[model samples]
Structures are given as C-alpha cells and as structure tokens.
Target: SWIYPTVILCLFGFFSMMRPSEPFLIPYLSGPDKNLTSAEITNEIFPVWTYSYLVLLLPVFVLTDYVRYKPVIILQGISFIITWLLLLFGQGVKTMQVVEFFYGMVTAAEVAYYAYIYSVVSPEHYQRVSGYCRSVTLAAYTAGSVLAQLLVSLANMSYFYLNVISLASVSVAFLFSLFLPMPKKSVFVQWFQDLKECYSSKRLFYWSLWWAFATAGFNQVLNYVQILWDYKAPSQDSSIYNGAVEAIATFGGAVAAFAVGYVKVNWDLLGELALVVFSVVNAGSLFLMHYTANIWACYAGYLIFKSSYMLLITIAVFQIAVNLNVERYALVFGINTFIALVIQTIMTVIVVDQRGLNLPVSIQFLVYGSYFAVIAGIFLMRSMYIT
Candidate 1:
C-alpha cells in the first residue's frame, strides 16, 4: 500500500541528493583567492545561509504540520529549483548570500520530507522503510559525487556544467513529488493548542533532544569537510577529494543502514553506549583531519566522520520512530530540528563572523573535535550514572 508513495519519495531523495555542483560551489561563487571577497566572504556566506535555516525551521515545521506534509514537500522542491538557478548564474557575495536564504528554506524542507515518511507509512514498517529511504538518500549523493568526479576529472566539465545536470535532477524530483497522495489532515485549525499538545509528551521530548543535538553536530562537521580537504592540497580539485570521501561515507552508510534491518541493536540497552562510542570516534575523525598534512588522511577522517554519523542517526530514527505517535511526528521532528538550527546558528556566528573569532580552518576543526568530545562526555556520564 505504501509502495507508490515510498518509491516516489525515494526518487525525490535520489535526484535531490544528487547535487553534483556542491563541492565546487564555494570556488565558483567566491572566485579566485585574491578576489575582493574570496574565502572571507565565502566563509561568511555559508553560516549566514545556514542561519536562515535556523530562522525559518520552526515556523516552517509548524506550518508543514498545519498544512499536512505533501504541500511542504512540494514547496521544498520549488525552493530547491530556485536555489540551483541562483547558484548556476548568480555571482557576488550578496547574490550568493541571497542564495543561502533559499538554501535554508530547503533544508527545513528536508526535515519535512523525513517527517513525511511517518505520514506515508504504517508504524510497523517504520524501521524498514527508514533504512530504505536513508539508503537511497545516501546512494543518490554517492552516485552524484562519482558522476561529478568522472565529469570533472575526465570530461573536464566545469561547475556550471555540473549545475545544469543538477538542475535537471531537481526538476525530476519536483515532478515526481506532485503525484503522491494527499495527507488526511492538517493542524491549521486551533493551531496553537495543537502545537502545545504536540509537545505534551516527555518521551517525545527526550528522543527529539537526542536527535536534534547529535544530528546538528553531525551536519556542521559535514558542511565544512570540503574546506578541510581543500586546505590539505590547495591545488587539487576539492570536488574529486570530496566526491571520493563522501562516496565511501555515504555508500558505506547505505550498506550499514541496510544492515540495520537485519542486525538487532538493543538501543534500549546499548543506545547510550552507541552514543558514547560514536561521539568519541566522531571527534577522533576530526582530530585526524586537524593534523592531516596529506589528502589521504583527510579522506580517512572524513569517511569515518560521515559513516559514524549515519549509523548514529539511523539509530536515532529507530528510537524516535518507536516512541512517536504518527500524528505528532512532524512537530517533534521539526522542533528538534529548529533547536539544532539554533545551536548551529550560534556556533556559526561565534566561529565564522567577521567580528568574531574567525579562526583558522585547523583551529575550527579543533573546536569541532572538542565540541564532540564534550558531547561524548556528557552522554557517557548520563549513561554511566543513571539511576
């Protein structure tokens, strides 16, 4: 019964994640290193764009729930289309800065799509479907990276060429998304009371908290990984490096996620342990990248970080899916995502702002490594000392 919608959703993630132009985006938008802006402006642009995600995440989350998931997903696809167009032709710091605003809008849309699964599937199939969906999502990205590498390295395709193909993929995504069945209800009537009720459960709150903070940290590290690689070998194509590393990380993650269905992890018993081990390993990956003098070490570290995050987040999906009632799914997912965006926004401003620290990339990785260390310590203590 859910096959059509699920397949449609898979297609959506497939083309959507196939963003071949992503790795070269900074270089394309920022121009040569000696430009008036260069990385100072490019670096500032990323966080500011991500900041838009935090700003819009909450209301969009609520609105998506209020209007049902399908409309939000469609709206997200449109935002993505607009975002790529801007990236394709636009220039200057301000134009790309505007691009980031649309970027934030679609990221919230990502949460909406993830949350939409609950509305589409019966709860019994939740874990199975989650893995399938997560796998395709990673696979699409991996495939895109591989394709882009072949294109750039062999065909000598430029970023603009990549954008044309990326635009085509996103267009396909929006077209397929339109055919899905409509959700049965929305929260628009008596919205505030409904919003309050959505948060009325303690179990929901805890799972959401875990999902929010951990994934937020995961995404931040991923967002900046290209920067790390570029530093290791400034002359090399960062996209090639990025594609290879992400190919392993994402495709490897897809394998592990598929394995999730077959393997039996006792999150109720081992969940806390998973958190501690992965967090430490997560930080460890960054630590390697921090001292890495060669491209290979950077690749190793990036792969470990990405793979570890995928496994941890897949575990999170199970925990939350197990605990959540179908009705409150979007609200809980959205709220936690909003909270994550808040922390991320704060970190961006503190770390990337012109008036702020504006630390070196090496120092930034150190900060990121230490951030995860604290996260691990807190979770380890919670697990060890809990009554």
Candidate 2:
C-alpha cells in the first residue's frame, strides 16, 4: 500500500535536497575556475531561471497531471542531473544560462513530488506521509548545508569537489525515483474553471495577493543573496559563511513556521496589519543588509528576512486553506505560485535584466528594499482604510 510508496518518496526527497554545493555556487561561478563576471552571473545568467520557470510552470502543471506523477518525478531527476553536469563541465555565460534553464525545469517539475503522494496514499495517511516527505527534505537540506560549511571551513575542500559530491547525491536520487510505484489513477482537471470559482471572495483575493507579492520578493532575495554575500566578503580573500548562513536561515524559518501554529488571533481582522508589519521588517532587513558592510550583519538581516517571510506564508497558507476544499485549495495554490513567478519575471526584466536598468548588485538590493517598502506602504493604507 502507501507504506511502500512512502519509503521511496522520502528517499527521493532526501537525496534530491542534499545539495551541498548549492550554497557555494556563487563563489564557484564567480571565482577563478569559472571566471564569470558578477554582472553576468547576477543580471544575465540568473534571470534565465526566472524566465524559463515562468514559461514552463503552467505546461509542467498540466503535464504532471496528465502523465501521472512518476514520470514527471523521473523527469525532474534527469533535469537535476543535467543541471549539475552542466555546472561541472560546461563553461561560458551562455552555457550557464542553459544550466539555469534546466534547473528551472527541475523546479517546475517539483509539483509532481508533492502531488504524487495524494494519488498513491489514502486520505487518512495524507497528513503523515506529507509530513514525512517534507521533514526528510528539510533535514537533508540543513544537513547538507552544515556539512558544506564544515567541509569548507575545517577541511578546506574545494568548491569543485562540493559540486561533484552533489552530482553523486542527485544521481542516487534519480535511481531511487525509479523505485516509486506508478499511480494508476489521476484523472485530468483543468485549472481556469476552478480558479475563477475560488476568486469570488475578497478574503481569498487579498490573502493570495499578499502571497504572490511576498513570495516574489522572497524568491528574489534568495536568488541574489549569495552574490550580496560575495560582495561583502569576497570569497577569494575571505572565508565564506554562505553554508552556515543557509543552514541557520533554514532553522530560523522552521522555528517561525512552528510558532505560527500556536499563535492565535483574528486573522481576518488583523492579517492585513500583520502583513504590513512583517513587510516593513522585511524591507528594513533588506535595507540593513544593503547598508551594512559587515558580512555578519548581512547574514543576520537575511536570517530575519527569511524567518518573517516564512511566518507570514504559513499564516497565508492557513488562511487560504480554511476558505476552500482540498481540490480548490490545490488549484488556488498553483495559481498563487504562478502569479508569484510572473511577478518575479517582470521584476527581473525591469530591474535585474542586463537589457533593462542593469543595476549593480548593491543597487539591486536597494531596489529590493524599496520594493518591499512600497508593498508595506500600500498594505498600510489599505489596512488603515479598512480598520
């Protein structure tokens, strides 16, 4: 039954996320070995991921449902392998952009990872299986980041070996993904009808609005934070703390998420105000990270920014889920994520794209800070008029 499927899914999840090289990627790409310019890495190569992800997201969603989950999971595994292989063997700015494209495919296919469980497992076991799947990935990610930090700081291992190790781990994940039992069931369902049905309420509309905006901002911060760290503490001259920072940020976010369950108030009455407050905190943290020259301050700011976003997203998910049934919840969740990706793509085009303003990493962060501040200002006025 589900027991067999559960074991393999957890294994796939664990191995896939055990990517130690991820934290040090900016250093590797920008350092002497790859020798990519920071502007190219930040403005040109990285923006490809957002564009490809936005383009592929809806198609992958439909394909995942139509083909069932197992095949798409396997596709994700292959994409993961290709991405790392490209990172290891490929060179030049254009090749790295291709790597970003494959990486985008890998991320877009991740819908199948969580969606597979519901098709194979019983409704009663849904909670338990989902917890196991999520927990394993989180543990694996934290362990990988911690291991990366120890290896870099204590053992002085090279970044290239870190990627080699990551490739090996994802390869193992690919092999395990094949062991997952195929789902016989999974009837197709189109999204537009369900999306319009759920968007009838103002509550759902506003919560999803915040979800999209905050998620877009959060993704942008994550995509470029390492470059900011590299700017502050040049990896060539200083010992990088990226792995440690990633590990700590994950822990902070988890704790904030857990705390969300215990804290209770009128979410409807106070939710907008919370959004205003935390978005301000997010904006302030970005401002601090931008202004503070110290690496430690930047790290602290990242930790705060990530934790606050996690806290609010947990609340946002709960708020949305409470308003809809399981099927509609899934539809709204996908739509919200798609909307977030669209917003991020536009931001990338206007602000970070080499074809656009092409601001420096330092100036780019200032824009991010101002972006959040503007979100905070809009919500503040809305909440004020409402209350």
Candidate 3:
C-alpha cells in the first residue's frame, strides 16, 4: 500500500538531507586542506552554484516530468554523491566550481522528490504525507547539524571527516532511491496551454508571485550567511557555532511548519496580509543580522528569519497545491521555481558578482534587507487592494 511507499520516500529524504558537512562547507574550504582564498570562495566559486542551478533547472524540470519522477530522484542522489566526493577528495578553486555545479544538479532534481509523492499518494493523503516528508528532512538536517557541532566542538574532529560522513550518508540515500516504485504514466498535455491555465487564476498568480520573490530573496541570504558569520567571528580567532545556529534555526523552522497543520485561519482573506507582516519580520531580521556585531545576535536573527520563512512557505505550498492535479502541480511548482531562480540569477549578477557591483558582504545584506522590504511593500499594496 501507500504506507510502505511513504515510509520509503521519507527515508530517502532523511538520509539525503542528513548532510553534516553542509554548515561547515565554507570553513572547510578555507581551512588548511583546501587553502582557497576568501575572494575565490565568495566571488569565484560560490556564485557558480547559482548560475549552474539557473542553467540546469529548466532542462531538469522538463526531463523529470518526461521521464516520470523516479529517474530524476536517482539522478539527484548521484549528483549528491559527486558533490561531496569532490569536496572530500578534490582540490583547487576550479574543482570547487565543478562541485558547485554538481550541487546545483542535486537541487534542481529536488522537484522530483515532492512531485513523486503526489503521483503515488491519493489526494486525501497530500497534507499528512507532505508534512511528514518535509518534517523528516528538517529533523534529519537538525540532527546532522547537532552531530557536526558535537564532532567539531567536543570530539575535536577535522572537517574532512565530516565530509566523509556526508559522503557516506548520501551514498546510503542513493541506495534507498533504487527501492522506490516507478509511476505508471506521466502527463503529456500541451505545455504552453497548461502554463497559461495555471497562472491565469488570480489566486494562483498572487501565491506564485510571492513564492518566486521570497524564495529568491531567502536563497540569496542563505547562500552567503556563512560568509557573514565568518566575518562576525573569524574562525581562527573565535570559536564559530555555525552548526549550532543551523540546528536551532532548522528545529524552529520545523516546529513552525508543523504547527501550520493544527492552526486554523482564513487564509484566502488574510494570506497577503500575512505575507506583508512576515516580509517585514524577514526584513527586520536581515537588518538585525547585518547591523549586529555580536555573533549571538546574528544567530538569533537567523533563527527568527528562518522560522518565519518556513511558516509562510508552508502556507504558500498548501495554497498553491490545493485542488491541483499531480501533473499540473508539478508544472506550476517547476515554473514558479524557475522564475525564482531567474530572479536570484539577476540578483547574483548585480549584487554579488565581481564584474557587477561586487558589494562587500555586510553591504550585500543591507541590499537583501531592502529587497525583503520591497517585497513587503508590494504585498502590502496588493493586500490593501484585495481588501
């Protein structure tokens, strides 16, 4: 029955996401083993992930649907293995860029993970099933972070071993993916027509619009948060608690997302208003994170920012997915994500690229703070008109 499949999918998500080396990626690169300069990591290598993600998303999205979902999931597992393997054994800035590209493939394949569930489960099970899937990943992530913190802080283990653990975890995830059942058929409808129908609804349009904007903004901030943290507390001079901060924020986000299931609200009338309010919260948190010299305050700000975003995103996912068929759901989700990647690509080109403004890390955060404020402003105006 669906129960077995659900457990298998959740297991896949859990093992795939249990990546302890993730929070320590930057530190590991800059440490003695890699010996990469800060400029190379921030300007040269990191932006490649965004670029490669943008480039690969559309093709992967189409392929995921065309080949059904399980193949893409398998591809993601393979990409994850390559990414960590490169980090574990490879060297040089160029090798790191290749690692980022593979990591991009891993993320681009993520659409299959969510889409596969809807294909397998009946409509009534969407809510509970999605909640389980989402929560399992978060729980796994927090466990990974906590484990990393313990290893680094208590056991005095090197970052290299963390990469080893991560490689092993993703390898196990690859094995789990092979066990998933294949779907019988995939949608083969008119692509352009379906796209038009999906966005033509005002309800869908507004939700998708917010999803793209907020997701892009959130991603940019997250991509560089480690750099900001390192700036606040240099790894050599001060003990950095990146793993601890990531664990707490993820735990808070998971709880916030879970609470959405129990909380009842008139989302249709108040959804945009909720967006405006939380956009402000996000903006304020970014401002706090930027202005505060104390690393603790920065961590606190990240916690609040992450939790609020997860809470709102859970609402958005539900709002968008409700009543849509599995095929259309995948289409809408892919398109909206594609648009988000486009927005993030533009932001990356302008704000972070060396050829562009190439603003310092702190100033870039100021820009992100204002970007969320602009998101709040747009939604506030929309909410007023809707009411």
Candidate 4:
C-alpha cells in the first residue's frame, strides 16, 4: 500500500539524516582536530544550537496546526540543503555549531511528519500505524549508527559522505511531500482551543506529566548510551558493540510494534507497567555500569532497558493521539513536546556534569529512580481516574 512505501521512504530519509551526526558529531567536535573539551562541547556548542531549536518548537507546533504539512516538508528539505552545505565547508568548532543548529531545525520535519500521519490515518489503525512508524524510525536510526561506524572504520571515510547521503534523502522527501493531500479544514483554531481544553482536563494533564517524565528518561538513555559505553570501554570494539546493541534494541522495538495492538486490547495496563519496569532496568543498568567493568553486561543492560523504554513510550503516545480528534493532534503533541523537552533538557544538564558530582553511581540511580517513581505515580493516577 501507499502507506508502507511512504513509511519506508521516510525511514530511509531519517536514517540518512541521523547516521552521520548522532554517533560521531560529539566525537568529531571534541576530537584532536578541534581540541575542545567534552564539557565545552556539551555546555557551549550543543546548547546554543539546541536552544534555537527549542525556541522554534512552539511556533512550529502552532504552524503545523494551520499550515499544510507539505510546505513544512519542503522547508525541511531546504534546511537540509543548507545544513549539508555548511557541514561540507565547515573547518572548525564554530562552523560545526552552525551546522548543528540547522540540523536541529531540519530534524523537526520528523515531528511534523508524525503529526501528519496521525491526521491522515483512521482512528482504528492509529496504534498499529504509530507502532509501525516508530519501529521504522528507530530501525533507521540504528542503521544510521551502524552505517556511520562502518563508513568511518572500513573505508576511513570522512563525515562529509553522511551529509551527501542526507541531502539526497531530503530531496526525495521533498518530492513526496509535493503529492500529499491536504486536510480539508484548518486545524490551527482547534490547536489554540486545545490548549485550554487540555488544561481543563485533569486526566490529560496527568498523562502529559507522566509522558514527559517517562520520555525524558527514554531520551536520555537513547542519546547517552554511546557516552556511557565510551566511559566503560574506550576501544574500537566498543564502537561496534554499541552499534550492535542499538540495532538489537531497534529490532526489539519492531517486534513490540507488531504486538502493540494485541497488548493494547488485551492488557492496556501493560503500557504503564512497561514504563515502570524499563525505568528500573535503565537505572539498574547504569548502576551495573558504574561498578562492573564487563562490556557484555553493559551492552546487555543497555539493550534490555533501552528497548523496553522506547516501546512503552511509543505505545503511550500513539494511544494519546488516537484519543484526541484530528484538529487537536498537533497542538496536543506540541504541548507534549514542550513538557518532554523541558525535562530532557534538565536531564541533559545533569548527565553532563554527573562526573563532577563525585558520585556517578548515585547520580545515575537518582535519575533513573526519579523517573520510575514518576511512572508509578502515573500508573496509580490512571487507575483511580478510570475507576
């Protein structure tokens, strides 16, 4: 069907966009050539670009509610072109920072694409469709990470090839966007009204809060695995191991997607339960990493925790979207984004300076414990509200 190919194509584009940057950008910037410290890279360069992205989030969120999703896709294509050009010509840290900022903006297309998918698909298929989309997206990301490692390791390739591939992918996405059918009425007015609606609904606010906390932990685990691996095992094998673990986790997500419908129907509470279990596992994994020097344990723990966390969050978000009408989807998701990002930003700050706290183990446990506790609260709250 058209949906299958569209999902595949979007996955390809996402993989290409993420492949070069996710695993290597930090290393590239902080490598011998640039001579910047990790702290400097994270605190100074990363935040500046990411903050620009955060500023754009609310506006773009509103825009998606009103504007044709296709035009936004086209703009993403343009942003990708500019980003690639910048990275292609960049010589140092400053140039790389600019490239990162543009990269962040272009990546917002994925979010818009998600909202667009919810808008078009029938409510009956919402959970399955969202599961499929998330699975493919994560698979693409895993492929990208592995591909980056291969390109860098085997052929001794430069990072530029990644950008070239990303550019081509964006071009294809732009073309696809041209033919996408537009929605009948403007979703913008509903989006603004949804803000008031969501606040008035205690259940919605509580779910959003739970979603934010869970997603924050999920994001942290996904993004920082490499850093954790590097700290535990600083070797070539570590790179390959991290990539393989990610690929495995992604495969787990795909399997989970195939089972989401059954789970949702037969055992809806499974989602909340998964959130708590995974958060605990994630924290426990970090604890193991702190004490044990076993690479295999580190990889195993990461795979188990990361996959569970991602699967739970994906299902929860899809359910939320399905419960809302088409007009309110983007705005609701945008608010969801805002909450998740705020928590994630704080988590990022904590993880970056965690080593300085003189108790990496305590810090990791605290982060994970706090996340799990929040999930537990959400689970209880949901039960009471439904009863």
Candidate 5:
C-alpha cells in the first residue's frame, strides 16, 4: 500500500533528471557566453558543481533528518526548477555560477530523496525498493540521453528548445512531489539512539566510505569526457554521438545493477578483497584508455570502468544496509558522500588546478590509473590485515 506512493515518487524523480541539460550542456552554454574558453568551462564551470555540492551536501543532509524527508525532496525539485529557469532566462558568468551552485543543491537534495525510501518502505522490503528506485533513475537517464540524441541528430531540434521541453517535464515532477507521504520516525528524535547504533561499528562506515571514494574518483574521471572530445580528438560528429555514448554507458551500469540481484557473493566475508580487485580492474581500464587511439576503445574502457564501479557500489550499499542497525540510512550515506567530495576536491587540486600538479590530458589519464591502483593496494592491505 505504501509502496504505491513510492512508485509515484520514484516515477517522478525518474523523469525529472532526463532534462536536455544531461547531454547538451556544453553546446548550449558555451557558444553564447563570452570570456570563457573550453578549458575554463571544464575547469571552472563543471567543477563548480562539485565545489558547491561538497559545501552544501552535509548541511542539507542534516537538515533533512531534522525537518523530515518530504520537504527536502520538494526542495530538490525546486532546485531543479530554479536551475532550469536560470539556464533559460539568465545570462552571463554570474548567472552560470548561481546555476552551478543550485545544481549542487540538486545533487544534495537527491541523496535525501534516495534515503526517503527507507522512511516509506519497511526494512523487509528495503532490498526490493532499492532496485525499483535505482532502476527507474538509471532507465530514465538512458532514455533521456537517447531522446536528446535523436532530437538533435535527426529531428534537428535546437538545444534551447530541448531545454524548454525539459523545463516542462521538471515542472510536472515538482507537482508530483506534493503527494509524497511522511516517514514513520525522524532520526532527530532518536539522534543519540541512532548515533549510538551508527557509531557502534566503524567497519560498516569504512566499507561505506571506501565505496564513496572509489565511485567518486571514477566519476571525476568521466567528467573530463568533454576534454577527450573537444580538445584531444577531432570534433566531428562527437556532439551528435555524445548522448548516444551516455545512453549506452548508462545501460551498461543498469544491467550490472540488475545482475547483482540474481548473482550472490559473500560480501560479509569477501567484501574488502572484492573491492580491491574491482578497483584495480577499473584502474586497468583507465590505463588502457590512456593508450588507445580509437574512439571505440575509449568507450569500451569507460563502459568497463563504469559497470565495474557500479557493481562495487551496489555491493557496498548492500553490505551497509543488510545488517546495519538504527538506520541513519541517509545521514550515514550522506556523510560518506561528503568524504568522497573531499577526496575529489583534493584530487582536483593536485591534478587539475593551476598551483598544483596540473598535468596534461594524456598525463592525467595515466595519473588517474596510478591513483586508483594506490587506492586498490591500500584496500588489499586492509583486507589482508583484517584476515
């Protein structure tokens, strides 16, 4: 019965993220904006989302628990509305800065929404609810990218118009947010009770934290895709095919997530070792990508990395959720996310910033591999020590 409201809520979030901005951000914003180069957009524009996301993520996470989940979910939808409006009507450098900041708020709010499920569904059904919610979001992402590709490639729709249509879809989602039901308990009421439970096991926290850092590292690498297409390679049909690539990669991730259900492994016994191995696997893919000349090879590397990381994170989520008591489910995951963001910020400073190491594209890819390998080795050592 409660599942029905969850279905509607998940459906709303599913369709909301499929905005044209998913695929057309660069082309839509870059051409008209003056005083900025591709490098600036990559360095400043996109990274601002990360910068702001980290700053606001923990605050919003705590706020959601105190005030409850429904408001945060609506706030997330409102952030989307505001971001889109800024993109549609606003202009100049200042406008984009605000847009990126709100975009971070959107990312923060989403964590609350994901955690919101626990509020509606009981623990027995938690396993089923995760797949249902995650599947919708992933499927919608792929669908949105595919549709964006078709709209521009064959339909010849302008990127601006695609945004207009996306705006409408999001507006509908905002309206849908109104119907979401309330949770049974606030962690705020039993803050110490949950904290006592949450703090009882540092092992679970480490598992969750490593999951965050590994996934965040992979995500940061993927964010530089525009560099691969725009600067490193000839910009032929890349823009047209960009969305197609996203759709395909997202499909691979979704498939891996789906497969995790039927396939079983003893994460309780082997979780650390498995994490180390797959971390290396993804690193190897990045190393392979560094040497590959063909675009297909690049995508193959990305798909392999993306799918492997997706599986690992799914496993981590399961490990943490399965037996975790006094579920600060959202707060704990939110804290892990903050840890990941911190790692990302430091890595960005070392690898992408001016005062820091600031390696070139080819060099940076190699460094990405090295960093992942280091992460893998650290986990391997931890696993051995634990045994």
Candidate 6:
C-alpha cells in the first residue's frame, strides 16, 4: 500500500519533468531557427497559445471531478506523448503551436491527480502525504531540467531531446498508473454533490478565494521570469544562469515541503505562516531584481522568490482542501482550480496588455494582491479552524 503512494509520487515527478518553461520554452522559440523576438514570443504568441490552453481548462474545471482520474491521466499521457513527438520532429511555428495547445490540454490531468490523491489518502495523513508528493514532484521536475541542461551542454543535443525525455517519463508514469485501484463511487454523482457542498460551505469559498489569489502570484512570476532575466542580462551566459537559478529555487521548495511534513500542526497555521513569509520574500525579491543590474544578484533574487512561492502555494491549497472536509476530493479541487485559473487568466491578460510596466511593477502587483487576499481569507476562516 505504501508502494501505491510512491508510485503516485513518481507519476507526479514524471509530470514535473515536462514543465521547464521558466527556463526553456521561450528561449527555444525565439532562438536562431524561429528568428522571433522575445517580446513577440512572450507578449503576443505565447499568450495566444496560453489562453487557448486556458480555454481547455474551463471544460476540465467542470468535468474533471466527474471523470475517472486514471482514464484522464492516461489521456494526458497520450497527449504528452503526441505533443512531445510533434515538438521533436515538427519544424515550423504552426507545429509548435499545435503541440503547445495539446500540452495545455494535458495539464488538466494535474488538477485531477491532486483530487485523486485527496480522495484516496486518509485525512489524518493528508498534509504529510501531500507535502511529500509535492516535494518529490518538484524535485523530479528540477532534476529533469538539470538533466536537459547537462545533455544540451555535453552532447550538444537539440531542444528536441527535452521533449524526448518528457515522452519517456510520462510513458513510464502511464505504465505505473495501470496498477492503481479504481474508486468505488460514480464520479458524476460525487461531482454534483461536491459542487453543492462547496456552494453551501462559506468556509470553502473563503479558502478557495485565498488559494486562487495566492497561487496567481506564483504563476505570474513563473511565466515572466525569462522576460525578467532577458531584461537584466541581455547577452550574458543565459544557459548556465537559468539552469542554476531554477535548480536552487526548486530545491528550496523541496526543503520547505520536507520541513512542513515533519512538523505537524492542527490548524494549518504553519502553512498560513509560510504563505505570508513567501509572499513578503517574493515581493522583496522582485524589488531587488528590478534594481540590480548584476546577473548574480538577479538570479539569487529570482531563486528566493520562486522557491518560497512554490512551497507556500503547494502547502496552502492542500491544507485548505483537507480542512474544509470536502468529501468529493476531485470536485473540490476542480472548483479550487477553476477559481485559480480565472485569477491567473486575468493576470495574464493584464501583464500582456501592459508590456511596458517592467517585471518589478508587475510582480509587486501580484504579490501584494495575493497577500491582501490571503489576509482577508484568514480572517474570514478564523472561526472554521479545526483546533
């Protein structure tokens, strides 16, 4: 039975391997072959693809709780395999766009996966199990990115190799998933009841709101890091700089996860404190990054900002779900995701429209915005804490 959790954790790691865009995708798209400018890629083309992906989330947001998690995950695996193949073999922008769109679709599996875990694991073990799963997943993603960078450096491998690695990892995850036991209830009924329950519970609403706002800041920073780096060090050694920064930031998340798991708490105050600390640190880092011209300082600031945000958001979401006693796990997560996605999508729109604001201003808005929301939610949910 313990093996089951390990297997699921490994599957999460495989998923993480596919998500190195903070260090890879924009650069790849704007490289020699594409001949596109970074602004063009980030502001225009990327958003178009990303928004299209968000569109897919709307349906998954409503339906994921009603679908069998295993089948959805297998579908995601197939999507990943196909997308990777396209990224590897296909040459043109059109091909890449198609691949990106499907990659977006495949991302739905992640929300469903979290829901599945909550459903399967006992409530008493939720925080520890969730923390371990998140830490391992992030570590796997970091490892995958490091491996890709190493391969690129040593073998002079093309960007295609990254996709190839992703394909392999997900394929293995799919095989592992085949062994998971099926849930007993009808997903459709559970999903409907979950929705009703979510609406009926004021506490869940407040928690979901906090979750959405806090997570949006993290999402915004991640999406814009490459832009920030490019602005600071236009022609520096981008590969080494980006790889090292991502590795350190991701490791910080892993460390936080471990620490939180070991120190159990009854009221999720630990997670709440982590979120506040992370928000403040991230905001400060963004300010530091904006003023610093030195590449090293910029990298350090980014690492600190990124890692803390990852840790806080990862813990907060799971803690809220577990505390709320939302029985239909997938449905609660789906609702939570829907709120987060909306916030992120709006933030993406704002960032895209205001291309001249620079990275620091944008990040400040995100951090402050999230922090304010969390503070409000905490007050609203004060009476609901189990302790």
User: Evaluated with TM-score, which candidate comes out highest?
Assistant: 5
Q: What lDDT tens digits, residue by residue, belong to model 5 across residues 1-387? A: 657866877777776776765787777877653334576677667778888898889776566667667888898889889988888876766778888999999898887877777667776565556555665677777888887887787888877788887888787888878777777665466865765678567468678767667866876787775565455567777776655776887778777766554455556677676788888888898877777777778778877887777767766766666656655667776777887778877887888778798877777778888878887888888787877
lDDT of 6 by residue, 50-95 (tens): 6655676666656665665666666666776777667656665567
Model 3 Cα RMSD, Å? 3.0
For candidate 4, the per-residue lDDT at 284 reads: 68
The CA lDDT at 359 in model 1 is: 80
- After superposition, which runs of candidate 2 have C-alpha atoms over 4 Å from their true positions? 1-11, 27-47, 66-70, 89-98, 114-139, 175-191, 227-239, 258-277, 291-295, 318-322, 326-331, 353-355, 358-363, 380-387
TM-score of each model, paired residue for residue: 0.87, 0.77, 0.88, 0.82, 0.89, 0.82
**Tens digit of per-residue lDDT, candidate 3, span 135-200:** 778888998888788888798888999999999999999999999988768555676676677677
What is the Cα-based lDDT of residue 178 in candidate 6? 64
How many clashes (backbone atoms < 3 Å, residues ≥3 apart in a chain or on different chains) does model 4 have? 0
| lDDT of the candidates, in the order given | 0.75, 0.78, 0.82, 0.63, 0.74, 0.64
Model 2 lDDT per residue over 270-323, tens place: 667788899899999999989989889999999999888877776676566555
In candidate 6, stretches whose alpha carbon ends up further than 4 angstroms from where it belongs are: 15-22, 30-45, 186-196, 199-203, 267-271, 291-294, 352-387
RMSD of 4: 3.9
True-structure RMSD for candidate 5: 3.1
Candidate 3 clashes: the total is 0
Once superposed on the true structure, which residue ranges of model 3 sit more than 4 Å away at CA?
A: 187-190, 230-239, 262-270, 291-295, 323-326
